[PDB]
Design an enzyme around this catalytic site. Structure first.
Site, PDB file in Angstrom:
ATOM      1  N   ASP A   1       0.782  -1.242   0.000  1.00 52.00           N
ATOM      2  CA  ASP A   1       0.000   0.000   0.000  1.00 52.00           C
ATOM      3  C   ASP A   1       0.817   1.298   0.000  1.00 52.00           C
ATOM      4  O   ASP A   1       1.320   1.718   1.042  1.00 52.00           O
ATOM      5  CB  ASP A   1      -0.937  -0.043   1.225  1.00 52.00           C
ATOM      6  CG  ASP A   1      -1.908   1.127   1.291  1.00 52.00           C
ATOM      7  OD1 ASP A   1      -2.112   1.796   0.281  1.00 52.00           O
ATOM      8  OD2 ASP A   1      -2.468   1.349   2.368  1.00 52.00           O
TER       9      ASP A   1
ATOM     10  N   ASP B   1      -1.555   5.581  -5.548  1.00 52.18           N
ATOM     11  CA  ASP B   1      -1.915   4.652  -4.479  1.00 52.18           C
ATOM     12  C   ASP B   1      -2.190   3.216  -4.914  1.00 52.18           C
ATOM     13  O   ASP B   1      -3.244   2.917  -5.469  1.00 52.18           O
ATOM     14  CB  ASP B   1      -3.152   5.229  -3.767  1.00 52.18           C
ATOM     15  CG  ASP B   1      -3.591   4.412  -2.565  1.00 52.18           C
ATOM     16  OD1 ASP B   1      -2.858   3.515  -2.149  1.00 52.18           O
ATOM     17  OD2 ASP B   1      -4.677   4.693  -2.047  1.00 52.18           O
TER      18      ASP B   1
HETATM   19  C1  10Q Z   1      -7.286   3.808  -0.146  1.00 54.87           C
HETATM   20  N1  10Q Z   1      -6.815   3.130   1.099  1.00 54.87           N
HETATM   21  C2  10Q Z   1      -5.483   2.726   1.181  1.00 54.87           C
HETATM   22  N2  10Q Z   1      -4.602   3.095   0.248  1.00 54.87           N
HETATM   23  N3  10Q Z   1      -5.084   1.927   2.221  1.00 54.87           N
HETATM   24  C3  10Q Z   1      -6.018   1.376   3.225  1.00 54.87           C
HETATM   25  C4  10Q Z   1      -6.571   0.006   2.867  1.00 54.87           C
HETATM   26  C5  10Q Z   1      -6.786  -0.507   1.534  1.00 54.87           C
HETATM   27  C6  10Q Z   1      -7.319  -1.815   1.502  1.00 54.87           C
HETATM   28  C7  10Q Z   1      -7.629  -2.531   0.213  1.00 54.87           C
HETATM   29  C8  10Q Z   1      -8.473  -3.674   0.178  1.00 54.87           C
HETATM   30  C9  10Q Z   1      -8.765  -4.337  -1.040  1.00 54.87           C
HETATM   31  C10 10Q Z   1      -8.224  -3.867  -2.261  1.00 54.87           C
HETATM   32  C11 10Q Z   1      -7.385  -2.727  -2.232  1.00 54.87           C
HETATM   33  C12 10Q Z   1      -6.819  -2.224  -3.446  1.00 54.87           C
HETATM   34  N4  10Q Z   1      -6.370  -1.833  -4.434  1.00 54.87           N
HETATM   35  C13 10Q Z   1      -7.094  -2.071  -1.015  1.00 54.87           C
HETATM   36  C14 10Q Z   1      -7.528  -2.326   2.806  1.00 54.87           C
HETATM   37  S1  10Q Z   1      -7.058  -1.186   3.996  1.00 54.87           S
HETATM   38  C15 10Q Z   1      -5.303   1.383   4.538  1.00 54.87           C
HETATM   39  N5  10Q Z   1      -5.573   2.713   5.080  1.00 54.87           N
HETATM   40  C16 10Q Z   1      -4.807   3.356   6.057  1.00 54.87           C
HETATM   41  N6  10Q Z   1      -4.846   4.726   5.968  1.00 54.87           N
HETATM   42  C17 10Q Z   1      -4.134   5.499   6.829  1.00 54.87           C
HETATM   43  C18 10Q Z   1      -3.357   4.961   7.861  1.00 54.87           C
HETATM   44  C19 10Q Z   1      -3.305   3.559   7.995  1.00 54.87           C
HETATM   45  C20 10Q Z   1      -4.022   2.736   7.104  1.00 54.87           C
HETATM   46  C21 10Q Z   1      -3.915   1.305   7.315  1.00 54.87           C
HETATM   47  N7  10Q Z   1      -3.865   0.149   7.436  1.00 54.87           N
HETATM   48  C22 10Q Z   1      -6.738   3.353   4.461  1.00 54.87           C
HETATM   49  C23 10Q Z   1      -7.220   2.312   3.442  1.00 54.87           C
HETATM   50  C24 10Q Z   1      -7.750   2.928   2.119  1.00 54.87           C
HETATM   51  O1  10Q Z   1      -8.943   3.201   2.010  1.00 54.87           O
END
Ligand code: 10Q
Length: 390
Positions: A36, A232
């Site tokens: 991520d 992202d």
């Molecule tokens: C956009 N976006 C992101 N970039 N990362 C996170 C996650 C994405 C998925 C996920 C699931 C399935 C497919 C995909 C794909 N392609 C992604 C699960 S959790 C983590 N997060 C955090 N933000 C801030 C601080 C800590 C954290 C954490 N942990 C906010 C989430 C988010 O909404």
């Protein structure tokens, strides 16, 4: 290809995310970790959960160190709570080094883990500024660079299959590559073009022009980066600011007007299907995003195809039809260049030189008539004005 040990080390798909194998603790405990670039914490499941078949067991690691501090991470789609600590971490198909890094041991979560995703944790690759609880919690990559001789840069090649992958298939298919500390030339064709990393928190960039099949969307460029534009790997769709999304969808509808689709399709809610092999790719437009270049008044563009923005999904009746969901959606938090953009390109996160590189991906899906592209340079003025300021 100078990093054969890391090529093809990723698995997954845009809908569930792409992950890499890592090990934590002594003896090593293997876990699959979501890559991520949109966050900055290394966090893993550390307690039983219905959707996990394995997790980090701190009591079995002789090198585990308790930081005696909790961490709560709530976000839009979900949230998790954990206990901070450090341990020795490695990446089997990565650099041959072992580092001591911070680990958020997840003890409780809501809508974080996904049934069948096959990953048990998340690797936030962005900067310390957005780490939770605060910027004092050193991110994994920062630790890796500080403790070893690995160059401060990584690159990602996310590979969409171009068709639906069932449970067994997604587990056996190569989903891409994460090259830690370098650039592998076998993962792209053509030249690499770099855009400046505007500020080091998320991987923020500046879009200066947008075209749909060559036609300028013609909006004030600040709109394209309101309130920020980021790259992202943790977002499935290409997400655009409300007004940009509205203009873009209007233009995409106009270009593909020979076929009418229900509003639900454009909202990303319902799928559209065509008889096997007959998807009318040609009626859908290519989309180009112009990005600020490294040279004054110079820009370059990345162009994707509908094969990137129409996400393959299995038909509700698992028929032989080829079905898709529209993967461009609106955002109230700026532009997000997710897997829809990333699957078309090999992306270089050059932290050392504060820039992000783009090149046509050796694994992007296309047809015999069109291909994704990265072209330049173009003369562009007042690009600094395209950046948004609160
Ligand atoms: C956009 N976006 C992101 N970039 N990362 C996170 C996650 C994405 C998925 C996920 C699931 C399935 C497919 C995909 C794909 N392609 C992604 C699960 S959790 C983590 N997060 C955090 N933000 C801030 C601080 C800590 C954290 C954490 N942990 C906010 C989430 C988010 O909404």
């Amino acid at each position: 290809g100078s990093f054969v040990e890391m090529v093809d080390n990723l698995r997954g798909k845009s809908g569930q995310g792409y992950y890499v194998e890592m090990t934590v603790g002594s003896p090593p405990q293997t876990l699959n970790i979501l890559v991520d670039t949109g966050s900055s914490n290394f966090a893993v499941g550390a307690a039983p959960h219905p959707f996990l078949h394995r997790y980090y067991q701190r009591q079995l690691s002789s090198t585990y160190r308790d930081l005696r501090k909790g961490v709560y991470v709530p976000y839009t789609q979900g949230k998790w709570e954990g206990e901070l600590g450090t341990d020795l971490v490695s990446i089997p198909h990565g650099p041959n080094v072992t580092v001591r890094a911070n680990i958020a041991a997840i003890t409780e979560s809501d809508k974080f883990f996904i049934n069948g995703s096959n990953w048990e944790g998340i690797l936030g690759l962005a900067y310390a500024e957005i780490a939770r609880p605060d910027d004092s919690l050193e991110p994994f990559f920062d630790s890796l660079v500080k403790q070893t001789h690995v160059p401060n840069l990584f690159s990602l090649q996310l590979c969409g299959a171009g068709f639906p992958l069932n449970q067994s298939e997604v587990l056996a298919s190569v989903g891409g590559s994460m090259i830690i500390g370098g650039i592998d030339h076998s993962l792209y064709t053509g030249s690499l073009w770099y855009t400046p990393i505007r500020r080091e928190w998320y991987y923020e960039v500046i879009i200066v022009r947008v075209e749909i099949n060559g036609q300028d969307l013609k909006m004030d460029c600040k709109e394209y980066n309101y309130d920020k534009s980021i790259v992202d790997s943790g977002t499935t769709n290409l997400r655009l600011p409300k007004k940009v999304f509205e203009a873009a969808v209007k233009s995409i509808k106009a270009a593909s007007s020979t076929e009418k689709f229900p509003d639900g399709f454009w909202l990303g809610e319902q799928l559209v299907c065509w008889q096997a092999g007959t998807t009318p790719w040609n009626i859908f437009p290519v989309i180009s995003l112009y990005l600020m270049g490294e040279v004054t008044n110079q820009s370059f563009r990345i162009t994707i195809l509908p094969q990137q923005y129409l996400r393959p999904v299995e038909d509700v009746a698992t028929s032989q039809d080829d079905c898709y969901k529209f993967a461009i959606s609106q955002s109230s938090t700026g532009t997000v260049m997710g897997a829809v953009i990333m699957e078309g390109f090999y992306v270089v996160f050059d932290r050392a030189r504060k820039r992000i590189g783009f090149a046509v991906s050796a694994c992007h899906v296309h047809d015999e008539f069109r291909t994704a592209a990265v072209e330049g340079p173009f003369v562009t003025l007042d690009m600094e004005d395209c950046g948004y300021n609160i």
